[PDB]
């Protein structure tokens, strides 16, 4: 018997198929997070600015209180 190269089929590798698929973000869903992060962003930032006003008047008060300076 003579032995040569043998053939293999099984699944035939599956040639030409789109492996690319959309993931995580769809379109409308990411905009709700996007503007949602903005709405949370400005609201939390301005609370510290109002807290800065408590310091702002009190810091400049030191110059008014000190006249022997």
């Amino acid at each position: 018997x003579x032995x040569x190269x043998x053939x293999x089929x099984x699944x035939x590798x599956x040639x030409x198929x789109x492996x690319x698929x959309x993931x995580x973000x769809x379109g409308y869903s990411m905009f709700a997070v996007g503007i949602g992060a903005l709405l949370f962003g400005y609201w939390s930032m301005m609370k510290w600015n109002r807290e800065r006003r408590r310091l702002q008047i009190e810091d400049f008060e030191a110059r008014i209180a000190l006249m022997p300076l």
Binding site: X4, X5, X7, X8, X9, X12, X13, X15, X16
Partner: protein
């Protein structure tokens, strides 16, 4: 159109674009690569055992 060594029997896919721009001239080569394994797989399945020379 013009077979060389056992052609037309093997299923070939030819990518052809729309515009003559560099992007479509790039896409066809990538689409040639995705539609190249089909020829290789058909060559693996269809092998007559015999002579080399």
């Amino acid at each position: 159109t013009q077979p060389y060594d056992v052609y037309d029997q093997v299923e070939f896919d030819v990518p052809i674009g729309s515009r003559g721009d560099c992007y479509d001239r790039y896409l066809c080569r990538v689409e040639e690569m995705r539609q190249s394994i089909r020829i290789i797989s058909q060559c693996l399945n269809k092998m007559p055992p015999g002579e080399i020379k």
